[PDB]
Design a binder for these strands. Structure first.
Length: 49
DNA sequence: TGGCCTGCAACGCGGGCATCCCGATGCCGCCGGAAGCGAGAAGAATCATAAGCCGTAG
């Protein structure tokens, strides 16, 4: 549900590509932080296979 | 293929023995230098105290 309980939001997306490993992100929490380099799609598919 | 180790035989010189002359040396007495590291001082490696940007939030 949305902020006022009037709409619906999908929890996760039915994706086919691991965008976390392909592009990544760089965010910082209140006490934590993360940083992930991008990668190549073909080698990720090869590793998954 | 060329050179080296060794046996056989001939030659020579020095090991051993003693001693006379000799050179170091242990000891004694007097003098020199270096060590003694402890301490003062200087240089350097390391630790402690500000920003700049990475991207959403106010």
């Amino acid at each position: 549900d949305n902020y006022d309980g009037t709409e619906k939001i999908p929890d996760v997306m039915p994706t086919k590509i691991p965008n976390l490993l392909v592009n990544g992100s760089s965010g910082i929490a209140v006490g934590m932080a993360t940083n992930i380099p991008p990668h190549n799609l073909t080698e990720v598919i090869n590793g998954c296979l």
